Design a protein around this ligand. Sequence first.
Ligand code: HEM
Ligand code: HEM
Lengths: 155, 155
Amino acid sequence: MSTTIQYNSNYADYSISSYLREWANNFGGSSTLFSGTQYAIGSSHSNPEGMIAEGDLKASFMPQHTFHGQIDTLQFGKDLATNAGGPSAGKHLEKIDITFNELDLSGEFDDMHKSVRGLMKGNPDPMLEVMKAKGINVDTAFKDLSIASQYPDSG
Amino acid sequence: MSTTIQYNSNYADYSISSYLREWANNFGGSSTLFSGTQYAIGSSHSNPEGMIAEGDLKASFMPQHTFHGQIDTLQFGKDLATNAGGPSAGKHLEKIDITFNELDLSGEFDDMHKSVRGLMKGNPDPMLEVMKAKGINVDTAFKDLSIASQYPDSG
Ligand code: HEM
Ligand code: HEM
């Protein structure tokens, strides 16, 4: 498939060159920027299970040696789908089972891959150890778990 | 900020452990999976400029030695914002100036960082060389550029 380009009518008289030069000139390891990452992983079976790791960040350095790994939300469910607004807008899960909010996984990059790969091969153990090391109780039903709350009706 | 967790009422009697074990067991370098990445970079000034690189992929190997770098859409504009559906759902640009569709940047990871960093410091030249090497004409106004089309009214 050949590359196609869409432009706002305000830039009709610009070239790619004159647009990007202007964008580059009007913009201003991180410093001093806003950056955000969304990773989506899903299976190939029907009603496929999926998960999303996401985070965003301010500006400059490690906080445990990762730039794109500044992850603070982790979500599990089924049916990854494209967001409104097109492919550029990333993904959402159609069926959301569990969402971890303010779960700082930045320090498990430099362990998150072992956790995600484990998950894909039927093994939650490394993910569970990461969660336990943050003080999360993984052996309590969600209904009794203090930091957990139920979504209204379905999402 | 302390971690909080949200769950669908169907999993009220599950623990994190029994949920993730079940999810792990019902799931099934890539093989044989659906994976997707969204990178968002924005400035810290008012009406901040922003860009989004996004792609997704099927299953197993290099196609020029990158897994998360399987990028085929690139979008420039202003005002990065959170998608409907919460932080997990990633970002969109409120003001979209230009979108490159089916622009395969996977082979510029192993050059994309030099391009993005250039952009941030007022220099489009490395981005323009990547585009030129794909056969894109960067010195033609969008209105005359054959592969380009105008968005209706504003987006
Ligand atoms: C905006 C588009 C960008 C894209 C598409 C992109 C993509 C990537 C890819 C594919 C990798 C290696 C593999 C992976 O992601 O798993 C990577 C690594 C890395 N990138 Fe970027 N990147 C972008 C912007 C930036 C910027 C602006 C910076 C720094 C100012 C940066 C800093 C880094 C660093 C430090 C790594 C090494 C691993 C890490 O700490 O995450 N990237 N990027
Ligand atoms: C689902 C959650 C995942 C997260 C949050 C995540 C995050 C990251 C991060 C932070 C890096 C290095 C820096 C960067 O992204 O720029 C990375 C690199 C890498 N990851 Fe992942 N990853 C995930 C899933 C996976 C899976 C399932 C695989 C393979 C089956 C994988 C394979 C790789 C490889 C090969 C690299 C080296 C650079 C590249 O080719 O992109 N990742 N990942």
